[PDB]
Symmetry: C5
Subunit: 326 residues, 5 copies
């Protein structure tokens, strides 16, 4: 067949390690575009972002050159990348042992020498996230692609400006929206430059899981702690009520500590609210113990009334602040 | 032997990367049928479906052509796929790093050129599931198979209509039933088309695990919360009973939050019932605290009677609604 | 040396994909015997059985044939399986991504053409288990070995009847005993037959872990629930005692739900006993609340006496039934 | 260079599968010595021992033979094992899917034909452990190395008696000391013998983790249970104290069951002590309920005094026995 | 092209296993420098340090030698390491099964024969850590690189003194600072020396996670235990308050035991503080039980006053000591 003829012709002496430049003072312009098809997860316990998508490679191999008229058309031809040269472009913030692709067995080569690859992949990428508004947090995770072997004088990583589009994924957790990728240049020993593309995706947590698990038991334990100082001290049920709030808030703290990551810069607002509720139970237990201590003078109810007034107004302020965060 | 003769004959110049078409404007029709032998698990915590089954490949390789009379019969012959051409057909929603097969070492080739492969595999597939009726939920998970390298003008993925059958698996968790697969066409840059088969399987959770773990302690804590307002307030055991319900419902919430996934769109009905029980304990604690607060006028029992009446009728309505869900 | 001479002689034109039959209407009889050396674990949470053992292959390769007198003896010779033909026999219920062996680098070939392989392996096998008597359960897990590529007309999987022996392993968990393997024939599209061996091993759980973790706290919480109705109602300690049983039985339920698998057909007897204890605490709390409700007529002790009598006789019946299970 | 000359000379016709014997009735003596550099962990939950060390191979390859005077010295030469013959010696109790080495890329070959390998490795080995003295337990785990392909008539596994040394590792968990390795011979079908070395290492748990987590809360809950019968029954705080001990001992039991393995032969002494404390709380709750039951004759304090006396003397006996275990 | 000419010239007879020395009594000086770009995690539960960085190899290959004037410049050339010799330098304390690189597909070779490699990698390294000041602990973890095959007489591992720089990473967990690497020489059978570089990095935990999870509930439970002896004994709420502290401190202990590793040498200060709080609750429960025991002479308040005085002054001493640790 004619498809075997050009394949045996233009791969008769091809070496997969030779950089395809006609002159020694020349580079190859490798065009990249990462496109996410599905954001799988954002594991903040280990600061990784698991995602699925395809990275569009496009370079210009001048050694694979022919005219279609000698082969009766056939502009497109498909070669595995194990027999042609490929640029070593990997993630700059890879979060696993080795970088592997889902499909990497074919690459489209045109008659003009330009080569497309498009290997689909599952990318685990490190991305910095600040949990100062957990779980009502808007995020931004970056994927950095580039060459760690070839410098700028060997290859040139270029974004494609012909498709300056933006896309969105309406996940049930994250309302993922994309940011226009840019090029940022990393140096090496202040002489050699190692270029690379950077692509941000702006995650936005729209969750009903973390609200139901963390927001509503914390505000209801706050409600019970506010209901506590109407209990009269001379029956001996206020102290066991307070220690029940202590145990329930300890269980809620253990929930939160199981879910909140170790890799933490600032305290989340749900954690600060839970700490506020926990120390509020502590202060109310102090007031109950003092009240029953001098109950053995009996004009205690105005102290509990002003304590409920202060805790009511400050709890309304704190809850309104957390609602303004949401 | 004669089996070596045709193998050395029709693989004397075979290239595994050449697409087997006689004309350049021709495609190869690859027939697919996925068949599940056992659905292993549906991990909704990570939205994956682990299953075991074999995917039936069938294409037409015109380069492997011979007559049996020159080889004294032998219509069937078995070649490993590492020496012949195979289509790059993978899952469109694969949920692991790389796509691998359990057995992929043989493929049946006939004298008419048609090639069967049948590689058995363990497929981890992403599938969307809405837990609005957890755990009495009927589901539907899809397996999408297709080529991410060859377009429609190179290969053509075709369902086989000769076997339009349906099957079922009677698992102890899922009553798995199958749906007639169809073909859905995915586009690429609005010019190149990338076809593929889609196969739905309709899962149905028939579980006694999640009922015993979640349904019966929630309804029994509801029963205890309904029994609560018959306790007289002037003994100081109602408040510790209410905080015991608070701690028990917190433990049940921690059970549920351990089992309910983060990847959540809507709240499950067991979660809504547990939240209703938890806020019912909150309202009953408010009423008990108010009652013992003005116990220091003594006609409290009619308020507790009407409160039990309202909680009884609304609890019967909610439990009847959850039973109508089941 | 003479060992290289026959190796270069009878592998001078050997193809590893040719099925070794002299006539086209002939099969090769591959003799199998799986032998377990150690049953590692039975993970019922994922329905897998991890085991270690060697599978004894034995077939008849007529292409490796020589007389010892031309090579001065040397009946035994050892060839890696990468250079000779091997049958593609795998597990029919494999529970991992790919089937791999611990040692697969040598195979013994005799002068009569018969070939032994014996690759040792760690097998993860799916096996159906019914937990209707957890944890006093006698089990049976099956290992099915066969070819998914070669049919009956290509290879023939045969058990060896020369060694019809039975063995046993005295593990600290499982008293593992073996069952005589048999041959069961699986069909494919009702025309092609795909044979295979099946080997059952009869596990028997002899555990002191699950007894100490689950049986004794459940029966002691039953003992405390039986001790509950001797508490007089007019002190207000019966209700907090009952809610303490509620919280303790909730903790025990959370233990059991952590250990009991999701993949569940029937409720275990320890789970049914725990549910019975939990609803017994519910009924006793109902009786205590009713008693203290009409304590505000004072002839309550006969009701508690008959309640203890009914709960005593039915608890003795249930505990005797669970002991008869053991 | 001269280093390439002998490498091309004595590997000009080398086959990596030929067993290096001049006569057919000859074996090769492969000398083994495993040396542990660091014991990583002993996971008793899965009965594995993770360790790091190098296994010293030494055999006599008569096919790699030369005199140094033809190559101007160069007695030592270094060949990768992929081009020379190596014996297939693996662990007899391997605890992973496949046996792999950390470094296996070089092997030292001398001019006398003797070959050293020394591949460093991370070994996961099954070893039997009896937890009858957890966590004050002295242990012994074995590493068994041998060939599962070559029998005694092919290779001969030999310990080296020139280095009959013993070593020790002072870990913060295990005071690891080594035992002089010996040779134990395993049979196969009572005709073929499969030899192998066995090496015991005597672990000794010197832990402050398991003491602080398990020993001190159990003995302090025992202390509280002993303090319980001084509470007078006519205040209704003894029953809630006893149910608080029930809940605390249930939490401690859940700690222990999380840490104690399923793979259990005998109950640990900490588990037996916790069960004794738990049933002691049960007996004390029975005595408190009886006392408050006939409190409605008032000479109860001598019964509580003799109960404290019996529980004191038997608790001192049990604690002295557990201290004598330590 | 000219780039293929020298590649075919100086690799026309290259063997990848020959050590590149002109004389037999010569070594190759391999220059190493590990550089960390991001410290991923320090898992003290398994004593591993996961990090990302590149290790700078530099050796002198005299077999790859040419002048640029015969090839019109081209001093730099890039060869994959699979076709040239590379030194077998691995981690001496590797914490996984096999040592693999992220990128290892290129290596820069100059016209003077010196070869750079720079493979980026994710290193899991064992490092000793003493948790005597958890979580306010300054740490030091070491990465040891060297050859386990080539001795000092074959290769020579050398640090590069031209870049004696120090760097820092401002993580949200660890304020990572680097230490000047040195060379330490390991012996083998007291005759052969096996050199290697060692590089320390000085970690410093600056966390708000472990403080909020462990420090504040322990000090607040200490605060509640200090508030306990103002409760009058003749109401029967002191004992249930003390058992509530017992249950809350048990939950906090279970938090800490879940987070504190088994691999423990000394008790952490948070663990010692929690044990002190737990035994303080025990002593206060003893004093409350004694007080209510002889309440049935009534001058008890001075004993509780001196007990609060002693517990106040010793708690201030302990908390000031833990603050001086911080
Ligand atoms: C790489 O391509 C960009 C595209 O604009 C260009 O600006 C840059 O100079 C190029 N780098 C080179 C030629 O080294
Ligand atoms: C692929 O096969 C289907 C089968 O009906 C056909 O409808 C479709 O036109 C084919 N696609 C081509 C030929 O591009
Ligand atoms: C396979 O071997 C068994 C052994 O008895 C025999 O019964 C069966 O007929 C054989 N199958 C064939 C020859 O297809
Ligand atoms: C293997 O070596 C040991 C070393 O003493 C020897 O006793 C034994 O007989 C040898 N086995 C043979 C030669 O089969
Ligand atoms: C290795 O290099 C160091 C660098 O100073 C040198 O001191 C040492 O002697 C060398 N080792 C040899 C030549 O064996």
């Amino acid at each position: 067949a004619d498809e075997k003829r050009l394949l045996k012709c233009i791969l008769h002496d091809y070496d997969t390690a030779i950089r395809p430049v006609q002159n020694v003072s020349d580079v190859v312009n490798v065009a990249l575009e990462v496109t996410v098809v599905k954001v799988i997860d954002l594991d903040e316990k280990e600061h990784v972002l698991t995602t699925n998508g395809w990275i569009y490679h496009e370079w210009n191999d001048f050694q694979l050159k022919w005219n279609p008229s000698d082969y009766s058309g056939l502009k497109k031809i498909r070669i595995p990348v194990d027999r042609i040269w490929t640029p070593d472009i990997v993630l700059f913030n890879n979060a696993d042992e080795s970088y592997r692709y889902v499909v990497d067995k074919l690459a489209v080569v045109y008659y003009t020498g330009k080569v497309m690859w498009v290997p689909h992949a599952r990318l685990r990428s490190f991305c910095v996230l600040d949990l100062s508004r957990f779980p009502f947090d808007s995020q931004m995770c970056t994927l950095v692609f580039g060459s760690w072997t070839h410098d700028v004088s060997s290859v040139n990583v270029t974004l494609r400006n012909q498709s300056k589009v933006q896309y969105m994924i309406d996940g049930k957790e994250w309302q993922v929206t994309s940011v226009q990728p840019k090029r940022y240049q990393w140096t090496y020993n202040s002489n050699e430059n190692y270029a690379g593309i950077i692509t941000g995706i702006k995650l936005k947590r729209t969750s009903i899981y973390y609200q139901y698990v963390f927001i509503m038991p914390t505000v209801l334990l706050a409600f019970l702690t506010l209901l506590m100082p109407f209990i009269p001290p001379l029956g001996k049920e206020r102290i066991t009520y307070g220690i029940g709030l202590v145990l329930g808030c300890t269980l809620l703290l253990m929930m939160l500590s199981d879910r909140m990551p170790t890799e933490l810069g600032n305290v989340p607002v749900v954690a600060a609210y839970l700490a506020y509720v926990f120390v509020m139970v502590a202060i109310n237990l102090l007031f109950a113990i003092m009240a029953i201590n001098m109950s053995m003078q009996q004009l205690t109810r105005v102290i509990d009334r002003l304590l409920f007034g202060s805790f009511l107004v400050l709890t309304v302020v704190i809850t309104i602040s957390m609602y303004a965060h949401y």
